[PDB]
Amino acid sequence: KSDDVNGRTKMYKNIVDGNHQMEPGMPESFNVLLKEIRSLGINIELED
């Protein structure tokens, strides 16, 4: 219902098709936060 850009369209498509399934992905605001932190001299990333 929010900034998951690649997931909003998929959920809408699944709802119209009658599936009612969710592909969560990752919010866009967290990416914005990571970019804003990296704009300072602070390294930050996600490991595996």
């Binding site: 369209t9 809408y12 119209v16």
Partner: peptide, 22 residues
């Protein structure tokens, strides 16, 4: 406050892609 974070608009290509998705 200064105005920021404008809205996203729907151009022709985006609308056509939206219709292709469904």
């Amino acid at each position: 406050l200064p105005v920021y974070q404008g809205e996203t608009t729907q151009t022709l290509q985006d609308y056509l892609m939206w219709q292709v998705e469904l």
